[PDB]
Structure formats: structure tokens, C-alpha cells
């Protein structure tokens, strides 16, 4: 069955990137998936995006620029304070600041560098580089 749209969508995206396909659709469209996708779009790894209703859950269409090397989902929602980010980054990012992490804090889901800026911890969600 389906237990999390986000991980499957990120895996699908990465796979399509390996074959270098140009346009991708994510079937289970949610608000959270849209917000996270906007979040890394802010940093340029993906280009335009759109939502299209289908009368069931909407679909999310993206065109890929093929500059991502791996976009995975951190399933077990590890909560982390401000200080320990470097501990987790070493676990998922290849090098210093190489890409981002996605954290849901009290204000929402946004990048991890910006999270360090505002100094607000939260739940690790996904990573992409």
C-alpha cells in the first residue's frame, strides 16, 4: 500500500534524473509536497513546477534541469535542536554545505541553512544534493 507520498515522489524524481528524462509527474499531490518542492526550487535544483487538479488528489508536474545527484527522504522524522545540525549533515550530505536539508519547525518547512539562520530547530524531513 501507500504509506508516505513524499519518499516515493523523491525516489521517482531521482530515478527519472538518472535516465535524464525531462518532465516528471508526481501523482499524490499534497500541500506539504508542494511546499518542500518550492523550498528546494528556491535554491535552483529544479525549475518551474505546477499543480494540476485531477478531481482525486491533484498531480504535480515538474521539469528537471538535471543538476541533482540524489534526493532522498529521511523517513523517521528525527527531531533536532539548533546545535546538532553538523551531526546530521555529516550523515547525509557529502561535503560542507553540499546541498540542503529540509526541516519542519514551528513556522513550517524550509531549508536548513535558513533554519540555522533563524535558529529554530525541528524535524528533519528530507535531503537533496
Amino acid at each position: 500500500t501507500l504509506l508516505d507520498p513524499l519518499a516515493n515522489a523523491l525516489s521517482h524524481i531521482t530515478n527519472s534524473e538518472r535516465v535524464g528524462k525531462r518532465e516528471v509527474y508526481i501523482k499524490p499531490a499534497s500541500k506539504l509536497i508542494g511546499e518542500v518542492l518550492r523550498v528546494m526550487q528556491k535554491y535552483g535544483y529544479i525549475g518551474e513546477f505546477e499543480f494540476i487538479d485531477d478531481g482525486r488528489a491533484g498531480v504535480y508536474r515538474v521539469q528537471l534541469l538535471g543538476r541533482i545527484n540524489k534526493a532522498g527522504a529521511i523517513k523517521p522524522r528525527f527531531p533536532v535542536k539548533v546545535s546538532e545540525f553538523e551531526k546530521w549533515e555529516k550523515r547525509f550530505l557529502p561535503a560542507f554545505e553540499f546541498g540542503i536539508l529540509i526541516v519542519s519547525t514551528s513556522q513550517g518547512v524550509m531549508s536548513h541553512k535558513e533554519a540555522i539562520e533563524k535558529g529554530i530547530g525541528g524535524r528533519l524531513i528530507a535531503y537533496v544534493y
Partner: protein, 155 residues
Amino acid sequence: ARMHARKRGKSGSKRPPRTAPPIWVEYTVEEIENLVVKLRKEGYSTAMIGTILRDQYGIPSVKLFKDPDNPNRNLTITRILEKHGLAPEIPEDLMFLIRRAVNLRKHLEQHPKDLHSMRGLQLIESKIRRLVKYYKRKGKLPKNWRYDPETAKLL
């Protein structure tokens, strides 16, 4: 169906993303209230009634018509049935499973050495159990209400 057969068969069918009821129809909402009470009062199960409407009356979906009595809800055949107290107490699908189980059990009593039907009995039973648990959670059945072969015979 994959709970037991594990067969990925896709016999499902398509319903486009239309929100408002179609223009080309003519029947009014109260008109179809009248029609559904007419059809239902001869004893037709709600899926059969919806099929009847789609086929001869040519009305795509009762869901497409908003409930006049509730702006926040869309009109479903069951809600019309209960709008006049003719909605059945025990919901339909589970009653179907009940009667199927009963008739099978008679055949089995006649035929003891058909173990394949024993397996079928186990499966349909587990189906009834699961739906019973579901409705118990949703409170559409008495909590103390139970499936029992004898009362099923009575039903």
C-alpha cells in the same frame, strides 16, 4: 482485489473531474428525489438504483448534485433514502455478505467434503468480521450487535 487473491486486476472504471452537474441534463434535484424513492420503494439496492439512473434515466452521478438541505454536502442516494427513513438499518454490503454466507453454509451442510468451499467460508467470514469491526468503530451498528450463524439465519 488483492487481500486474498493477491491479483492485481484493474476492472475499475473512470469518472472525470466534473464538479457541477452537467448542463445537458434536465431532471431537477427534487425530481430525482421522487425518482429514487420510486425505484427504492420496490426494493432495489443502492448500487442497483444508481445503475438504473445512469442507464435508462441517463443521469451521470447523484453525487454531482449538491444537497439542497445542506450547502456543505453533496447528494448521495443513501442520504436520500434516510431522508425519508427508508435507508436500511444494517448497511447493504454487509447484509449481502450475510446472505451469501448463509446460503453457502446450507450448501456446505449438504456437501461436507468440499474443502475449497471451506476456504471460501473462511474468507467471506473474515470479510464480515472486518466490516463489522469497521462499523463498530464508526458507530453505525450497535456495539453489542454481533455476527452469529443462528441470528444470520434469522436475518
